[PDB]
Specification:
6 chains, viral protein, about 0% helix, 3 strands, binds 2-acetamido-2-deoxy-beta-D-glucopyranose, part of a larger assembly, mainly beta, binds a molecule of 2 linked components (NAG-NAG)
Amino acid sequence: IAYTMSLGAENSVAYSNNSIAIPTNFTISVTTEILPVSMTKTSVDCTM
Amino acid sequence: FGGVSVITPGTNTSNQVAVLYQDVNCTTWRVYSTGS
Amino acid sequence: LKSFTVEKGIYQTSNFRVQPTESIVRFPNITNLCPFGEVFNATRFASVY
Amino acid sequence: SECVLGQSKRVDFCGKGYHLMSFPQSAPHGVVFLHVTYVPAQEKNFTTAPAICHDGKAHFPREGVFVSNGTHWFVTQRNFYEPQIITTDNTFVSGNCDVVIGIVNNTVYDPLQPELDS
Amino acid sequence: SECVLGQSKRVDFCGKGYHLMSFPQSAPHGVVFLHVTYVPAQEKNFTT
Amino acid sequence: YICGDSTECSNLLLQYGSFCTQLNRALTGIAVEQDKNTQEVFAQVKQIYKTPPIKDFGGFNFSQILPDPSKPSKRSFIEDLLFNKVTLADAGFIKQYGDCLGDIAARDLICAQKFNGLTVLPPLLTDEMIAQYTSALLAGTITSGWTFGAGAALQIPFAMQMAYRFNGIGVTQNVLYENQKLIANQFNSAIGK
Ligand SMILES: *[C@@H]1O[C@H](CO)[C@@H](O[C@@H]2O[C@H](CO)[C@@H](O)[C@H](O)[C@H]2NC(C)=O)[C@H](O)[C@H]1NC(C)=O
Ligand SMILES: *[C@@H]1O[C@H](CO)[C@@H](O[C@@H]2O[C@H](CO)[C@@H](O)[C@H](O)[C@H]2NC(C)=O)[C@H](O)[C@H]1NC(C)=O
Ligand SMILES: *[C@@H]1O[C@H](CO)[C@@H](O)[C@H](O)[C@H]1NC(C)=O
Ligand SMILES: *[C@@H]1O[C@H](CO)[C@@H](O)[C@H](O)[C@H]1NC(C)=O
Ligand SMILES: *[C@@H]1O[C@H](CO)[C@@H](O)[C@H](O)[C@H]1NC(C)=O
Ligand SMILES: *[C@@H]1O[C@H](CO)[C@@H](O)[C@H](O)[C@H]1NC(C)=O
Ligand SMILES: *[C@@H]1O[C@H](CO)[C@@H](O)[C@H](O)[C@H]1NC(C)=O
């Protein structure tokens, strides 16, 4: 099947003079981030 | 004239493929096989 | 380095390259001498066509 | 350097949310960071106002924001809901109350007048 | 990440002056940031 | 490119397939990297926040940069100007064989490039999608402040957001509430300029 890609979920937000949303609870999150640091070191013999 | 690309899943899943011909309308033409 | 002086460190040289010892020849053992007189010393040759 | 040996105020640099701490781990030809962060979860709707007028002078909160239960008024912090009673050591006075747009009428409790009264 | 989704305390990173806010806009093969900042104008001499 | 439309030279060249494959692999990696770069830059947010329904931000005028629902694209005036300034060279993505054969008495660049096996691939994300992403970012940063970048988005008045930002740089928030008109006028003048 071939289709048109979606740009994520769609929603909106309420806004007025004096409407404010304040959190009451919280959550502790743990995230993984991977980073390369080095590659393999190599040597070449020209004549060989 | 004209580029050709092949869209395929893994060969361990199926053998059906799709062919994308660049710089050409389809609305015969310069295609390998019209098909459907 | 193309110089008589070398700084302190570690350098890489050529791999451990080993020289051969002797030489051998292995040809099939055939004693006959194929005819040089039936090709070059024949009495009648064919036409070019 | 910036996320393991300290705390980072840069947004979205070490994990989503508000950065709390981080842990490094090794990997073949690489490193893996475990970022521990804080995320608010349960939002609640409230009505608010920038400042209040009590005796003709505006009162602005020192830290936090004014909110309302619907009939009463409180001052609370900005990342959590801990309502507190309006009082003089939570707000500061800046001029008259006829220049600010959106001011509301409310009373302010003084923590010294009842003490002197007795 | 650091100037549109938040406020930056890094000096001279997003526009001269004290950074207040920022707006992103698209462009062919590029992006354009409009940085809104705060600049003091009228200095006055005082003894301290 | 080397000896197209020739048979003997192809047979001679069959001893350079590794080189050709390596070049093609490098180019494919370049293209994939560019697509990844665009996706990483412009897709920081995931939820497409709609544009504000009502406009009472307090005097600040955002019609200059917000999209206008009057053209087949979601581009604002600034985006339209920026698009109009720089001119592309690929000339679209479609150029049929019946068109390059049409202009044989007139010289062309793209036709000569394509006849020698040099093609240009189209980007994965179209300009409309990037405009949608930018509009979502604008809506999030206007209606909810900076809270939409850390979890869910929390509603907040714009004047209070400006007071927060002024308190961030070490200036008390009474300065804004006593000078909101002047600040809004200055911002509108700056955006017009
Ligand atoms: C805040 O959220 C957490 C989890 O979302 C709540 O913790 C749960 O509380 C109930 C009853 O105490 C337990 O059965 C669950 O196991 C807890 N969940 C976890 C992950 O530990 C907590 O109750 C909420 N706090 C408030 C005030 O609503
Ligand atoms: C907050 O309190 C003041 C004082 O009671 C109110 O100001 C009065 O408003 C009425 C009508 O606007 C005037 O007739 C009075 O002269 C005002 N009195 C003073 C001392 O200024 C004010 O209206 C109250 N705020 C609101 C929204 O009602
Ligand atoms: C070729 O033939 C002649 C006589 O028939 C002889 O003298 C001569 O030796 C021959 N040469 C060779 C290479 O056999
Ligand atoms: C705040 O206002 C909007 C509009 O009434 C409402 O949809 C929303 O649910 C309210 N916020 C919360 C946490 O209920
Ligand atoms: C709101 O909070 C105050 C303080 O506890 C309380 O007295 C009042 O009854 C509450 N009103 C409602 C509608 O919950
Ligand atoms: C709040 O916005 C609405 C609609 O624009 C308007 O009726 C009202 O006057 C505004 N109030 C304030 C304090 O801005
Ligand atoms: C402060 O001192 C210097 C020296 O008198 C003077 O030139 C300067 O104008 C004073 N600053 C202002 C804002 O006038």
